[model samples]
Target: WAESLIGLHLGKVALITGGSAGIGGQIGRLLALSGARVMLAARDRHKLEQMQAMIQSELAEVGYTDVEDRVHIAPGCDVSSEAQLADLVERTLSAFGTVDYLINNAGIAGVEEMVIDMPVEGWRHTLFANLISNYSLMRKLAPLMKKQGSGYILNVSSYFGGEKDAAIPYPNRADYAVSKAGQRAMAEVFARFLGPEIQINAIAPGPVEFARRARLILENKRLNELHAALIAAARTDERSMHELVELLLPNDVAALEQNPAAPTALRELARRFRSEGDPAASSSSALLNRSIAAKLLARLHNGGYVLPADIFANLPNPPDPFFTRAQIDREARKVRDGIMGMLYLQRMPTEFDVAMATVYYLADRNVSGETFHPSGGLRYERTPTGGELFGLPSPERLAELVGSTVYLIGEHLTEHLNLLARAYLERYGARQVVMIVETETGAETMRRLLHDHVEAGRLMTIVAGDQIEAAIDQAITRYGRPGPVVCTPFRPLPTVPLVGRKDSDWSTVLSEAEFAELCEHQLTHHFRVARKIALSDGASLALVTPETTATSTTEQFALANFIKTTLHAFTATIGVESERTAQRILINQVDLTRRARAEEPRDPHERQQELERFIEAVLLVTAPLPPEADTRYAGRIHRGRAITV
Candidate 1:
């Protein structure tokens, strides 16, 4: 099927990012084999050359005389850098005269950390590499295709970032999920703007079998030996669990082995496990050794049911001299089977499966503004829909929370905050309201905005810094524990063009210092607040974020879009955590669309009316649902809008 699609583009040009390995490499190979001139762009020159050589060799074997001209390598083309991406565009145009297909596949899997532990830098890096780079490429190449009057753009997204309806809360990878979701949203925006002349779509694939790092680990002989040894020792009844663990310890491994080669392998294996599994472990290896031993003992004690593959499934590999080559092969098979079972599929999707989807999208002209998931059966889970109209609870239900305390937290109190506070004080008849702001000036502004409630002792204002958790505790003490905590941490940033922008101009839009400060305030601060709320007796949480729409997408509000998408995924993840821990904490999100024109004058009366509507929507989600309502409504995202009366 992919071959048929490739046959249509014999003399055309395909520019693939991250083409040095994995899915990108396979796509480049497939296109080149079908006579398409392929430009493989990546940061690694050696890997690019290796992939180029491999393709050339295959082409030669197939009796293709023009193998050299069929595939080209653009080394040091780091997609994260705008200058490098610009260079890639120029090089592709110079070489092929035009680009018929643009494959945006380069991306980094962010550090595996939960939202609380994720660094701001890691989040920014993943977003830039996966989402921004693709936007830059499309911005640069889409116009050229429009000039040519035809083109195809394929973004290799992931199932982690699929549609909101089909999305699973991906813990410990919020950055990755946000980048992928942004990619899909970005593609939809481009499709609408580019019109029918050019086609743009995204393919969201699940875990691929040929992922470079996973394949490297799977094929490492020493790693296989380590895994097999661990399995063999776990299965052995000749020694007690304590003795077995002592024998496998890094220092003790040398004493057990008489052969020098065996000890050397064991020591190397232990070092690998220590460095890869837990870098922060003590240098003595006691902590690391204890963790491995605990896992082994636990598995062995459970009915003596031990599979060699299950021994180190979650940890880094280990080596032993006792296991044979056949045993290692069997362990690999078991590991693969375990993965397939987890994915609910007979077999894992290969790089070719993903590449084939890319080619199919490229060849099919009618598919635009769509996301295709070639993720085996991973996305087959049933996602229930239809809760409250537009994910908003009833106004009558919201009104039932008459004596609940509401805490409104933000960097500063904007007019929107004023309306929300007013609504909580008057419309809903809240017991009390607490507003937490960063600066004294913001606290003063908030106090004045709700002067009546302040004078009546119904509203209290607290100035906060990095001590948001403490501030919330202070508020809880005074207000006798809040029912719902609303966090509006992000302020809208300027919309910047992805292409045709100077590096220096970024400071004007958002400087490095400002970006870091914003991230700390928005992401880190919200994470702390969420943790605080989740641990509370019975408090619900609502996060306010910028709503992503077709119009907003075209505007390319890069910073705002990235933060909003991250917050959405973060909210979902917290919801999942709450359920898993049986916290019974309601987690919800309210997306507010910003004004279209920044320069437009705000009509005071009309603005108040719009905000009142927005406040109603916020309150609807923040208020707890009835027992008979769908429990999933606890995490529903409500799109707030102002209705014209």
Candidate 2:
């Protein structure tokens, strides 16, 4: 007997065809786990049982009860076979009494063969099986919940629907791509016919590692232009999970003149429509009208939850389910490292390494009535009462808190040592890494580790955010300019005078003409920074056109008029957003090292804490403005916000 409360509480029932594995299973699990009476409709009874058992295990471990009861299995029903699919729907409606969503998430690759050598029968069957079944499923099941004026039908499609420089089982496997294109159109039709009740959305993830990689690629000045050209030339296509190749990307206006003309409604539907399998999706979008997904997205935005940049940059990627589950675990680890690394860099230190130690201590105490010292490894993580958040919570970084549990970015030397140790270790280890700083201190910290720390089975490794970034880039100005630098001005960036110090600023006045000059400076190259420095007397920037801007896609609505566009291959950026790069770079190269005391050297642990805390509280984080930026949380999430209304 069906639980009467499931339908009463849920008010909607989801039928996820082929929700046994892949992205389908993931979606089903999420839905079931979210309290929906999920119907895992598939043609394999054994596989269905296994899926149900696995889901139950996961929920039970989390203290959920009768989890299996939540997932009603409609096994051994081939959705492609009209009679069986009809019967399956009958049984589902009979069991639940109503259907609010029909998730057509399951799909099989069409028969593979060279076009001429291909058996027409095989091609026809696969196309109809994969494509027609969906059309049929929608035709039949679409009206079941229409009386309540609510229902959704999501059809999975091949992302190869658009673009050319793609690997799509070539020689014209017209059936699959064409049918998918049809599915996209079908989704659009649903939007117009079913507006205000149901939403639809779609995606294609076929580029690189789908970890926000598409956004990076499209934002890349060189690559995006090249992609546009290739797309226009029929030289490339969209594949993998990153995106539909931007055959239609605009170059200027909106920081990227790129927009897919697919319907706003379809886009909304695809996002809000949950057809399970892999939580890791490749690409997403819309077809026609305003989709439900778009509606929800806009609602969230209007409600002050997210921004366009956040949607484009911060969303999670669909994982490759074909790989072992461990690979997913590894990806999770990398993501945490990335989050922690950013937080560590931005966190405010309770103590400093003496560069501004005495002054900061005095200012802090005088300002806030807290006494502090500036000697013998000033503990960066100490509380007001002098307790420490650094050191081993015990010795030997516990398994849960092992191997440099603190978020302190180290220098290249420390990074290198850790990298080597990881390579040689026979146990759980960190693979990819980056150390942030470039200084004698970073070098010296590793030297101490190699001396005797390893003999005690103790290891300290924190990749400098900059060093990690540099692997993908040959040069970046993360730390006090990797080399001597010159400062230019942009916008009215805020700066506070150093404690006990004044007359240090070259305060550049913000002006329209000067702002225009600054843009030109950002694009200009080879101009003597010496000349500009001498002329401005460190006040306002006069020159224009930065070296890097020569090749950037920031050019006005064009593929790139300069040669620089051709040379840039893959586009990427570290933590710093380009718009803020010039200013932030100036702030970092402030040269505190020059005024440092010559006594006991900077403690790696203490310095790490200070740097982390500073970054968190200042530069990288939000400081409350007229409106929050339309980007992902720029910095770290520190124990919730210290002050939120």
Candidate 3:
């Protein structure tokens, strides 16, 4: 049955990792059922497909046809790779345009052995799957969420990942524990960083029985055998049989107790424990404690409290039912003997309940950056206390956080990192990356395009927040006459305000604010930044002819055409103003037969002539042009000033 309660996630996109099956899959279903579109991701393509179909089926039942269309898939993911994680986010954006719920659920538990015996590689693998993967996804996706001013990121943490030690007996869980702890830490930092707009939190689930838990059991062969034997004995061995029952998962133990051979199995287990010399082997206190935990889970199960066997057992082709009828009955008898056990209930809280609680909390705008533990009772979890809702720090606080820097540019413009490098090489002998700052978009693009150049110290980045001009002054003061500011019009012109239309009024559709915003973007790049560079040693200014053609499919309107048509005039103005004070290059394209014939060069030697001819067409544009040369191409180069190249 679907829960009547709703979350704050309607019409939003939820990207969940490890969502193929089990708890992650269940979370996906619940989120989808609640009206949010879910993107389920996992290494198992088949399971991902299965889960997608399952969620859609549920959506059909719920009459949430709109929600059905929102669901998507990102299959074959190994969350450890930053590139894959980045790709996953990209795919989510492509489908939904925005990711409102980022659920980091993929992880590995590694082996359950003593920390002393664990290999360093084991620790590294565990942390990579759990912690670093979360970090990678968060770092890449946070900016998108931050931009929207409304997002919630839930890091699926664990009770084991908490600071305090739990009753579960495994000293070797250090790797798993540490990674989860790191996720909690990351949640805190990100919450504060994104504050007010984006809410971040970690959901730490207590002990829950599931098929995945059984898989963990299987990996530890010794524990797996012991758990199976204990469950069997809980059926036949009436004396101290309760001790054996507690050693196995609640689900498996409940199933195994139903078998007729459970009695014989219990007897067999008792002999093995009796013969063993080790204290842990003979009468494991951990097993006794776990047996009590089983009581806690059993009471909840019998009382129809939270999720039960039917709900938890609904899994994908799970291991052939691991429990017996007899053993289940016998275990129930022991639980029924005590009134206190009744308080523990017959239906223990499930992983699903924890996930639901998390969804409930995320739906609220006021709760975040804290931990929520859904152990069943109302208000059972402790509420976190005492921290201000963090936001941008004041200048003094900013200085303290940022400390001293050679330059703190409000924007870094490394898009032309290669352009500057090539320009410098053309002027001087050494080829090196330019240490200029640019905007975030520019820096990221150049970093990928010029990876080798950046690695070789050909490019550097300086991130600035508010005071961009101040950062420029500091760069000039400390670095001694900063390198030439190379700028490019990589950003496209506004398409909406220029050509957008309404039902009956196309002209009034473009608002004053929209027009000004569009105008400001163009003016800032073409004029303001150019003027800044014009101040430094008549800083080397590079211009380009507009990459527009009259033969395009989309008709160019009057205002839009006029705007693009004036670009060359400004290019020519900048070229003339910077004259010999700096080396100016305006790479211009040509449509003359000289260009078309050059496209298909002749022999190898002729290819060289064509290359230089093209270079001359570009480089010569910046040189003083004879009127005859201008008139020769005047018919081809309209608006004409771009020929100043």
Clash pairs, model 1 backbone:
225-319, 226-318, 226-319
Comparison by TM-score, 1 against 2, better one: 1
Per-residue lDDT of model 2, residues 1-645, tens digit only: 123212222435778888787556755665554456678888788888898887777656655677766678888877657688778888888877767666676666664322222334554455456655665665555455444555656555533432111112121243454345444434533343444444443333221114443222222322222222222222123231123322112211121223254333222333332232123422212111112223323322321222352333322233333222443455556754543453323432321122123212211211211112222211112101111122211122122212211112223224323433343232323221222234546545664655454444443333323222232122221211121122221211112210111221223322223322322222121112212221111111111111111122222111111111100100001012111221111111111111113221257765555434322222112111111322334221210111100
Put down candidate 3 lDDT per residue, 132-212, tens digits, no spaces: 777667655665676666778788876545422111112345456546655665565345445666788888775554334
Which window of ten consecutive residues has the lowest lDDT sum in model 2?
566-575
Residue 106 of model 3, lDDT score: 91
Q: What is the lDDT of residue 21 in candidate 3?
A: 79
What is each predicted model's overall lDDT from 0 to 1?
0.63, 0.35, 0.47
- Could you tell me how far off, in angstroms, the CA of residue 495 lies in candidate 2 after the best superposition? 68
Roughly what TM-score does model 3 have, to 2 decimal places?
0.40
TM-score of each: 0.64, 0.31, 0.40
Model 3, runs deviating above 4 Å: 1-3, 6-8, 66-68, 163-170, 210-346, 376-645
Provide the clashing-pair count of each candidate structure: 3, 73, 39
